[PDB]
Design a protein around this ligand. Structure first.
Ligand code: HEM
Length: 152
C-alpha cells in the first residue's frame, strides 16, 4: 500500500484537481481519446467527436470528466479502504462498458500527464511518485475484480 506520507501527498495533489474538477476531467479524457482513439469507441456518447476541437467544445465530455474524477476522488479519499466504492466500478466497467484494464493504464498515465501540463514545475518528484502508487493501487484492485469475472 501507500505510506501515510504518500497518502498525504496524493490528497495534497488532489487539491489541484478539486479547484477545477471539470477542467482537469475534460483534459484527462481528451488526453485519453487523442492518445488512444480506440478508447473513444467504448463511449457510444462520444464517438461522434471527430476532432479535438469538438472534444474541447463538448459540454457533455466536460460533464463526464467531472463524473469520472469525482468518483476517483472519492476512492482516493478512502486511502486504500475502497472496496465498496471500487467493486461496483470495476464490475460496470468490465460487464457493462467492456473496458479492458489496458485502458485504465492509459487513463492513469493521462492523469499524470495532465497534472504536469496544468501545473508545470509544481508537481514534484515525490508527488508524482505518490500519485502513481495510488493510481496503480486503484488499477490493481480493479484488475483483481476483472480476473474474478474472467474479463479481458
Ligand atoms: C480513473 C478511472 C475511471 C473512473 C474513476 C471512472 C468512473 C466512471 C463512473 C463513475 C461512471 C458512471 C457510472 C458507471 O457506469 O459505473 C463511468 C461511466 C463510463 N465509463 Fe468510466 N471511469 C474511469 C475510466 C474509464 C475509462 C478508461 C474508460 C474508457 C473507455 C471508461 C468508460 C466509461 C463508459 C463507456 C461509461 C458510460 C458512459 C455513459 O454514460 O454513456 N471509463 N465511469
Amino acid at each position: 500500500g501507500l505510506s501515510d506520507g504518500e497518502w498525504q501527498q496524493v490528497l495534497n495533489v488532489w487539491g489541484k484537481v478539486e479547484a477545477d474538477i471539470a477542467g482537469h476531467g475534460q483534459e484527462v479524457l481528451i488526453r485519453l481519446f487523442t492518445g488512444h482513439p480506440e478508447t473513444l469507441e467504448k463511449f457510444d456518447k462520444f464517438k461522434h467527436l471527430k476532432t479535438e476541437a469538438e472534444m474541447k467544445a463538448s459540454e457533455d465530455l466536460k460533464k463526464h470528466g467531472t463524473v469520472v474524477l469525482t468518483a476517483l476522488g472519492g476512492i482516493l479519499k478512502k486511502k486504500g479502504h475502497h472496496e465498496a466504492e471500487l467493486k461496483p466500478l470495476a464490475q460496470s466497467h468490465a460487464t457493462k462498458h467492456k473496458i479492458p484494464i489496458k485502458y485504465l493504464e492509459f487513463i492513469s498515465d493521462a492523469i499524470i500527464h495532465v497534472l504536469h501540463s496544468k501545473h508545470p514545475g509544481d508537481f514534484g518528484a515525490d508527488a508524482q511518485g505518490a500519485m502513481t502508487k495510488a493510481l496503480e493501487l486503484f488499477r490493481n484492485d480493479i484488475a483483481a475484480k476483472y480476473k474474478e469475472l474472467g474479463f479481458q
